[PDB]
Symmetry: C5
Subunit: 120 residues, 5 copies
């Protein structure tokens, strides 16, 4: 039953940080525009977070029905996409945390699958 | 009883993405204004989301009374209008996701009616 | 008992739209200032929404005590003031929705009193 | 038991108006800066709202323990500081509502103590 | 059982003030940029608040299991990091509250450990 709690709280903070990063890059350049530059990142961002929302919805749908693996996968991928979005977006400030967080997501999925398959 | 849960969660994320898109186009042009240009989109946006709110209200009113089709239609159209608004607004950044999301809404309503009439 | 639900949900969306309109007119003129121009509207806006808050508070205070008319009036006027504020503020973008929403509020109060006095 | 309800709801709207006023003065001068000018107000604002937070916390801590006067004072002063902050900040737009709201806070504390001492 | 309440409420206000400070420095210089200048502070800020989120999550995970010291430490450090972040960020407006709040955090941790070890 731990699962739903984990999922809810993580949903919460993930929304937090995403909004915060958008808040930051409200503060980029009074000099030039960056909506056009780096266009690609935003263009991917929208669809990404959309994947996020549509995952979370079915996750919250499937709570009472099953605590099993079927919903497990769903919720987990939902949590994935959003961190991915935050990564891509934050990239625009600099490329350092970009790669650092690429790597963190990598190890994160690694530990996920590790625990997934460490036991039947 | 699935219905109310579906509706609530979808309400939530829909608000999320709408606010986020507004956040983005807070970041359009330090060069020129776009409130005047593309006026039409905002002018439709306001009334659209207003339809949204007035639908959600009666939906939440009708929860305890009926799980049937009568509220079903209401809630569903409420969810419709808001996605429509997000579409129109996001258009201003570019016309690509514009048509993509036009199409997605199209197929979405299609599947809706499909399941509506697939069984008595 | 319908009453409190109606009131809560309406409170919610009303806050939503107010914040959204403020979000929009964060996007008015990189050309000139409009805080000074149209000053009057904001100057009335603050006190208006203040009426709003102080009404909602006593409304939520009076929930458990009475489902009757006494709280009915209070909650209803609370809902009034905020829509009024949204009207005044949005005016600054244009005078069209201004009058349209003036009229909508008018008919809204009309239907209110209609149902109030249609029966003992 | 009225007390906690009063406190919660008032907390809510107070946060509302504070955020709204900050929203407004996001819209001051594309001409010049006012973070430097009027510095003093913000410099006091931060510590003020900090008093606010640290009061509300112990208030919510002391809910289950006592409905008495001890928590009464705490919660009440917590509500005080925030209105004070809103006053100081809004001042920067103009000095009129400044004094008006000074006076309103004055009468407000007056009625508070009035009812505090009107009966044992 | 006091613990979870304390933690929740403190979480709440801490988020409040962080968002507010970001709101402020949305209002820094229409003259020059400060995202580049003072880069270091933001660069540390992101990872800091990330520590914050990942702590709060396991804290909320461990609620039902234990009211003991093990979760005590976790929650407490979670509350630490965020205040630290607010400190670093606010620094950019001025160096005064910077050191003042450095000192406040210092004394705060001091009282923490004081009460931690004042009794078995």
């Amino acid at each position: 039953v731990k699962f739903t709690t984990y999922s809810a709280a993580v949903h919460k903070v993930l929304v937090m940080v995403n909004a915060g990063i958008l808040g930051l890059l409200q503060l980029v350049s009074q000099q030039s525009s960056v909506l056009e530059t780096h266009k690609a990142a935003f263009l991917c961002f929208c669809v990404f977070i959309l994947f996020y929302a549509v995952l979370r919805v079915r996750e919250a749908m499937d709570v009472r029905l099953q605590p099993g693996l079927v919903p497990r996968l769903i919720g987990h991928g939902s949590h994935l996409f959003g961190g991915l979005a935050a990564l891509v977006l934050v990239s625009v400030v600099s490329t350092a945390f970009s790669i650092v967080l690429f790597l963190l997501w990598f190890i994160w999925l690694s530990a996920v699958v590790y625990l997934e398959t460490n036991k039947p």
